[PDB]
Design a protein around this motif. Sequence first.
Motif, PDB file in Angstrom:
ATOM      1  N   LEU E  64       0.810  -1.208   0.000  1.00  0.00           N
ATOM      2  CA  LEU E  64       0.000   0.000   0.000  1.00  0.00           C
ATOM      3  C   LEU E  64       0.850   1.267   0.000  1.00  0.00           C
ATOM      4  N   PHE E  65       2.138   1.170   0.349  1.00  0.00           N
ATOM      5  CA  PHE E  65       3.067   2.288   0.300  1.00  0.00           C
ATOM      6  C   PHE E  65       4.148   2.155  -0.760  1.00  0.00           C
ATOM      7  N   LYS E  66       4.261   1.011  -1.426  1.00  0.00           N
ATOM      8  CA  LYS E  66       5.311   0.824  -2.421  1.00  0.00           C
ATOM      9  C   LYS E  66       4.966   1.598  -3.683  1.00  0.00           C
ATOM     10  N   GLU E  67       5.712   2.669  -3.940  1.00  0.00           N
ATOM     11  CA  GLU E  67       5.580   3.412  -5.186  1.00  0.00           C
ATOM     12  C   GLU E  67       6.127   2.558  -6.317  1.00  0.00           C
ATOM     13  N   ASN E  68       5.244   2.164  -7.228  1.00  0.00           N
ATOM     14  CA  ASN E  68       5.557   1.221  -8.297  1.00  0.00           C
ATOM     15  C   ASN E  68       6.548   1.835  -9.279  1.00  0.00           C
ATOM     16  N   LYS E  69       7.790   1.364  -9.238  1.00  0.00           N
ATOM     17  CA  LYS E  69       8.777   1.787 -10.229  1.00  0.00           C
ATOM     18  C   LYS E  69       8.814   0.837 -11.427  1.00  0.00           C
ATOM     19  N   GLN E  70       7.630   0.502 -11.923  1.00  0.00           N
ATOM     20  CA  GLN E  70       7.494  -0.275 -13.141  1.00  0.00           C
ATOM     21  C   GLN E  70       7.335   0.663 -14.326  1.00  0.00           C
ATOM     22  N   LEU E  71       7.617   0.130 -15.509  1.00  0.00           N
ATOM     23  CA  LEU E  71       7.627   0.919 -16.735  1.00  0.00           C
ATOM     24  C   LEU E  71       6.198   1.284 -17.102  1.00  0.00           C
ATOM     25  N   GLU E 135      -5.042 -10.786 -10.368  1.00  0.00           N
ATOM     26  CA  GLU E 135      -6.244 -10.075  -9.962  1.00  0.00           C
ATOM     27  C   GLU E 135      -6.937 -10.778  -8.804  1.00  0.00           C
ATOM     28  N   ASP E 136      -6.894 -12.111  -8.773  1.00  0.00           N
ATOM     29  CA  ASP E 136      -7.479 -12.846  -7.653  1.00  0.00           C
ATOM     30  C   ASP E 136      -6.661 -12.675  -6.375  1.00  0.00           C
ATOM     31  N   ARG E 137      -5.328 -12.686  -6.492  1.00  0.00           N
ATOM     32  CA  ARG E 137      -4.487 -12.503  -5.311  1.00  0.00           C
ATOM     33  C   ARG E 137      -4.604 -11.097  -4.738  1.00  0.00           C
ATOM     34  N   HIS E 138      -4.714 -10.073  -5.588  1.00  0.00           N
ATOM     35  CA  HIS E 138      -4.991  -8.742  -5.063  1.00  0.00           C
ATOM     36  C   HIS E 138      -6.438  -8.573  -4.630  1.00  0.00           C
ATOM     37  N   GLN E 139      -7.354  -9.369  -5.191  1.00  0.00           N
ATOM     38  CA  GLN E 139      -8.730  -9.391  -4.720  1.00  0.00           C
ATOM     39  C   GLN E 139      -8.811  -9.932  -3.306  1.00  0.00           C
ATOM     40  N   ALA E 140      -7.895 -10.834  -2.944  1.00  0.00           N
ATOM     41  CA  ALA E 140      -7.836 -11.347  -1.577  1.00  0.00           C
ATOM     42  C   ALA E 140      -7.553 -10.234  -0.568  1.00  0.00           C
ATOM     43  N   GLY E 141      -6.526  -9.420  -0.820  1.00  0.00           N
ATOM     44  CA  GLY E 141      -6.211  -8.345   0.107  1.00  0.00           C
ATOM     45  C   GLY E 141      -7.177  -7.181   0.056  1.00  0.00           C
ATOM     46  N   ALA E 142      -7.667  -6.847  -1.142  1.00  0.00           N
ATOM     47  CA  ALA E 142      -8.754  -5.887  -1.272  1.00  0.00           C
ATOM     48  C   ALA E 142      -9.992  -6.351  -0.517  1.00  0.00           C
ATOM     49  N   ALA E 143     -10.260  -7.659  -0.534  1.00  0.00           N
ATOM     50  CA  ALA E 143     -11.376  -8.214   0.214  1.00  0.00           C
ATOM     51  C   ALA E 143     -11.143  -8.109   1.713  1.00  0.00           C
ATOM     52  N   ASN E 204      -9.999   0.591  -1.342  1.00  0.00           N
ATOM     53  CA  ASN E 204     -10.090   1.262  -2.630  1.00  0.00           C
ATOM     54  C   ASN E 204      -8.710   1.473  -3.237  1.00  0.00           C
ATOM     55  N   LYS E 205      -7.707   1.774  -2.406  1.00  0.00           N
ATOM     56  CA  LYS E 205      -6.341   1.945  -2.896  1.00  0.00           C
ATOM     57  C   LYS E 205      -5.786   0.647  -3.459  1.00  0.00           C
ATOM     58  N   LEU E 206      -6.038  -0.473  -2.772  1.00  0.00           N
ATOM     59  CA  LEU E 206      -5.633  -1.775  -3.298  1.00  0.00           C
ATOM     60  C   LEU E 206      -6.341  -2.094  -4.606  1.00  0.00           C
ATOM     61  N   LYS E 207      -7.636  -1.770  -4.699  1.00  0.00           N
ATOM     62  CA  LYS E 207      -8.378  -2.013  -5.934  1.00  0.00           C
ATOM     63  C   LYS E 207      -7.865  -1.153  -7.084  1.00  0.00           C
ATOM     64  N   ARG E 208      -7.567   0.120  -6.820  1.00  0.00           N
ATOM     65  CA  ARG E 208      -7.115   1.012  -7.882  1.00  0.00           C
ATOM     66  C   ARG E 208      -5.696   0.685  -8.335  1.00  0.00           C
ATOM     67  N   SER E 210      -4.443  -2.317  -8.163  1.00  0.00           N
ATOM     68  CA  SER E 210      -4.605  -3.561  -8.902  1.00  0.00           C
ATOM     69  C   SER E 210      -5.123  -3.308 -10.310  1.00  0.00           C
ATOM     70  N   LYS E 211      -6.016  -2.331 -10.489  1.00  0.00           N
ATOM     71  CA  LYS E 211      -6.493  -2.048 -11.843  1.00  0.00           C
ATOM     72  C   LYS E 211      -5.436  -1.339 -12.683  1.00  0.00           C
ATOM     73  N   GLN E 212      -4.586  -0.515 -12.057  1.00  0.00           N
ATOM     74  CA  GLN E 212      -3.418   0.013 -12.761  1.00  0.00           C
ATOM     75  C   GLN E 212      -2.492  -1.109 -13.205  1.00  0.00           C
ATOM     76  N   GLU E 213      -2.270  -2.094 -12.330  1.00  0.00           N
ATOM     77  CA  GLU E 213      -1.440  -3.239 -12.680  1.00  0.00           C
ATOM     78  C   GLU E 213      -2.087  -4.091 -13.767  1.00  0.00           C
ATOM     79  N   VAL E 214      -3.418  -4.199 -13.760  1.00  0.00           N
ATOM     80  CA  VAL E 214      -4.133  -4.958 -14.787  1.00  0.00           C
ATOM     81  C   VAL E 214      -3.986  -4.292 -16.148  1.00  0.00           C
ATOM     82  N   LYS E 215      -4.200  -2.974 -16.210  1.00  0.00           N
ATOM     83  CA  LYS E 215      -4.074  -2.265 -17.481  1.00  0.00           C
ATOM     84  C   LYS E 215      -2.631  -2.254 -17.972  1.00  0.00           C
ATOM     85  N   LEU E 216      -1.674  -2.130 -17.046  1.00  0.00           N
ATOM     86  CA  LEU E 216      -0.261  -2.151 -17.407  1.00  0.00           C
ATOM     87  C   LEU E 216       0.160  -3.514 -17.942  1.00  0.00           C
ATOM     88  N   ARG E 217      -0.269  -4.588 -17.283  1.00  0.00           N
ATOM     89  CA  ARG E 217       0.099  -5.910 -17.760  1.00  0.00           C
ATOM     90  C   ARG E 217      -0.633  -6.274 -19.045  1.00  0.00           C
TER      91      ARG E 217
END
Lengths: 255, 255, 255, 254, 254, 26, 25
Positions: E64-71, E135-143, E204-208, E210-217
Amino acid sequence: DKTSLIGIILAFVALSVGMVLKGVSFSALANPAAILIIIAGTISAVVIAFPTKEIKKVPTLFRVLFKENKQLTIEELIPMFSEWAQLARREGLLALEASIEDVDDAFLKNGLSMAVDGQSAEFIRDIMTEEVEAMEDRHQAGAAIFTQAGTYAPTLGVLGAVIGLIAALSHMDNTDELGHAISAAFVATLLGIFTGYVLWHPFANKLKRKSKQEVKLREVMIEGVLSVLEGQAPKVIEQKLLMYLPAKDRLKFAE
Amino acid sequence: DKTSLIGIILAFVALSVGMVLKGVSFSALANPAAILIIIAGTISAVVIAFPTKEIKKVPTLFRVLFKENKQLTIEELIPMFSEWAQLARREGLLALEASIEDVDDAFLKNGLSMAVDGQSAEFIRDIMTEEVEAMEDRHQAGAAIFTQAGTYAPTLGVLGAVIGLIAALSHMDNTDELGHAISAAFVATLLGIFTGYVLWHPFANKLKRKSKQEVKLREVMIEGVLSVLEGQAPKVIEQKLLMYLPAKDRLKFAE
Amino acid sequence: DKTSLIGIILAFVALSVGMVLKGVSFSALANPAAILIIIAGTISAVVIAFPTKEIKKVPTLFRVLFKENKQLTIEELIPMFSEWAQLARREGLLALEASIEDVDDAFLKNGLSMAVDGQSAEFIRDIMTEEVEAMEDRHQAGAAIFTQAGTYAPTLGVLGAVIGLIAALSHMDNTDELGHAISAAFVATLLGIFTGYVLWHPFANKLKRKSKQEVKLREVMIEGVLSVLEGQAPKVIEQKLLMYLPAKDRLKFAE
Amino acid sequence: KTSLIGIILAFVALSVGMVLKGVSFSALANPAAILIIIAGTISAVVIAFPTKEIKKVPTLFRVLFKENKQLTIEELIPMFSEWAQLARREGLLALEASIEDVDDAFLKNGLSMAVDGQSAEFIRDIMTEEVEAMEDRHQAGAAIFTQAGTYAPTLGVLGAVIGLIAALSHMDNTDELGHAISAAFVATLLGIFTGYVLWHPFANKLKRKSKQEVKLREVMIEGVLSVLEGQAPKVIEQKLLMYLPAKDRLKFAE
Amino acid sequence: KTSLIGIILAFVALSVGMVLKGVSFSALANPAAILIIIAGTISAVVIAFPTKEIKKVPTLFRVLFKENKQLTIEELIPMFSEWAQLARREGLLALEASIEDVDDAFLKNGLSMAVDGQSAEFIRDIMTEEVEAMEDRHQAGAAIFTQAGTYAPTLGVLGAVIGLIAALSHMDNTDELGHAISAAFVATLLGIFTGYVLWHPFANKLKRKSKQEVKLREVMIEGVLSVLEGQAPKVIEQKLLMYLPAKDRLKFAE
Amino acid sequence: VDESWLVPYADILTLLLALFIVLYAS
Amino acid sequence: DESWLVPYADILTLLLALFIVLYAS
């Protein structure tokens, strides 16, 4: 278990040394006999709604939460699988020893025996996906009882509280007994939300989460039967099914 | 019956024992205004909510809610199929047999009349399965009447409760025992939440479960009539509906 | 009509003679502030909530509640249909006079014209299906107005209530000016929950029900015109399309 | 255009609701503790959302007021049915009519892939995926106002509970309580108001304008598949006049 | 950063909206009326989840605090287009395209196998299954955080009504009503603070994210399957530019 | 996330509220 | 459906405990 009963004793000691510290000695919810309204009312509202095929499961899936699944988690299946599919590449598909000591868990033989018998490489996949979606629907109908009991229980608790308040106000409400009578009447809605929101909604949630974990195991077994009907190289399986376990344990899977 | 009325009497005596252990009357519930607000406002919001076609069919579903399902169960259709299919194989498909009794429905009578008149390989499903789906939308049209009634009736309880709140503060403070004017609103909210949560949402759920088992029953009737318009060798129909019976019915129906 | 206005006057008299039996006699009901808050706020929240192309349908919807749906109920389509196939058989599909008798129906006439100009058996199907899909999109957009009005009305009841609680607490708190104000300044949540839950949510519901009735009517129109396009048997058109009306009117086919 | 009238009507409904009941409205404007709703609500949506709260929020908060002067459906039919005729004049190459086209690149890529793009099913794939991605981006837009509407009254009544634990930690004979507990309930008023009459209908209007944009761009796909096939103006109007009400279908008779 | 500047703002919002109206801060300091809430929601969430409490509760409380340094997407175009140009030069034998790709393992199982594996109807499906599992693994923590946000204010209600029972019964000794009524006040304050300013927006932060990661992947999916054919690498620059917003879309002109 | 039960609970709170309002008379 | 009952139940609890603590004689 190691999560259900620990959380049960956490919630009960939380209520206990909350109430005896906030100034009530736990006997206010011990003496009233109006807690039958929750216990009989939830059973009534369930038995009107649910079929008798899906009721009289309430103890026999009330106990399935405490029973942890020590039967084929993923991390002991990657060595277990690509062992039958390995030996079939050098012995043959007619090796019926792959079922007779795998018969302890009857889910796997539904595809494995029917794939070593019948060449049904999509039809086995079709009936197995049908079976796991039917199992997900069955566990949803199972957890539906606990969700609906969580909906009915605080409503029935305040349905006891209104009876208690009518009793408190009809008789003699001009003294300090009004505080005791309303308070011991107001414990009924506390019975409603304590026994009713912190147990039945989390047990419904744990039914749902254990169903999600179980259908993840079943989809892993679907990829198992799809890979054992063909016989790939075992490393290719070991990067095929690997994505379902957490990636923290993906780097740990190198021993 | 045998599922509804047992829970009905169970919930009513669950009310009555709490009304008698600490309450006073059980006859002070009989006030005109609170029953007027809850019952009349519930049925008024329902007759606002629905057309006149879908609300003259209130008792026509209210009696199917109570009348017993001594009709078809899934394991009983294996005797009530596959035996005049034997008369269809070795003698001829025009052997009309279910036309004599037709105890089940005027549904497979259409199946045999089309088996002698409008036969096809798979085309005869569409009239049948769209009759099933039209019946399904009619049962959804019927089931929805209690859903909004249980949506409105506790909010009608709010309505009557705040009406009694305004009535409580109209010409108050007479320093006597006329503080049971508030208790009329307590009877109003008791009526609202009891007669919105203990029956209306359960009978809504019961219509939904009856409709679900009804469309499962109609789907296995589809498969049986498409079986008898193939001559599908009654040992084949044994393992055909294995994906229709639950996990417990795998061995009780294995004889 | 025949169900709207009867229910509306039933709900208003339910409120009125459920209140005048209990308490206040519309004296603390027309103090024109809480009324002003709930009504001006509800109309402001729905004109914020919806664009100007959809808020220019509020009177059109608000009277199509009441204007009854007297256009071709399904049982009189059977004499309206079941003779076009005789017209499509005795002189064929070249009946140029077939589209002039379509005196009251939305897209029967253009559908029959694009039926008789050319053989378009799948083209008519997806044109009329996209037609009813766009019409149901428009009616979902219609019923959403009353749905969201019913959402925002009781929130404004709470809003007017807490405005009145600020007005009543910060006031003369000796014996009665607390009580008279807090009585008068609580009709916001009464008239807000009444308008939200007993008026605009059943109005939204009735728009949904009439939209579903009209969509079933359009689907049976689709099946009727795609039966009478190719010239089916006029005796089995009743076998095709009587399923949408119940067995109570299927057994009235005995004249 | 219609959200302006609503905000003015909502504020005047609130203000006359103040002055009729007896709210002074100057003390409600200055309790000075209104950061629990304003800074609390923006804190909850900054915790709730990634770096799309100053970098996305005013950018569509001024789309909430921007009038949709982008190619309404009522005039959109004669924009086609001449292009469809012009495709059936010399072939599927004439891009010279696609010169004004001020709405979007959604017409640019669609028409310039219809001509010289040799693709039929590849059209609807990329057009429908573009409108689904645009719909997901507007879901991501409207979610901010949705969530702010959910968290606003809870933080307002959080201001109320802080006010009442401040008020009951006092001497409290007759008049300080009453006044301070009313000033406590100023916070829950702002939470209810700014968040029920503003952020839930702002989220709603973003959803409705998203429905309008998806409708206006799904209707353009038949306009691209039409000129790709080179249809006729007896088919275009029998294909896409359904996406406009019956009150305006008979007005297309001239 | 956007997680941090909101959490410090929410805690300082609570703090200064207290201290400009409240007097002591000793009300919610130690009544152990938070023991209903703080232990209550943690008891409910450990009943609710199957051994994902010492495994995955602090683990994605950390992400929840890791600033994603992905491309991010705007540097995928000078990444995939010149790689598709390399694939147009020599073919799929570009083993020198992945040895410098010291990045996430989502890239290697699409890039490195391009010399010895079919990838069109194979790797697209494998990457889709992998992002669905993600998406399921992040759905676990979002849940986990949604459920904490649903059991927290109800536990505040529960601690409130414990305070109510202890209030009007344990009565008529008026200097005892502190840790009943103020216990209920702090109880509902904890219920609507811890949960509505914390666990719903953490969910909501975990969901958002995760959706950034979904669109990126998924745009990585379209990139890596564009590498397999090298479909005229400027033509690749239209089927993915729709994912980045329209603000930074007209910036893409060089 | 049904949360369809706060409807009776808010009602008994309004009712006992107005009860202690009308008892608050001195 | 709706979810506004969350603030409304809160102001009811708060004004409830308010008239509880004012109920002192």
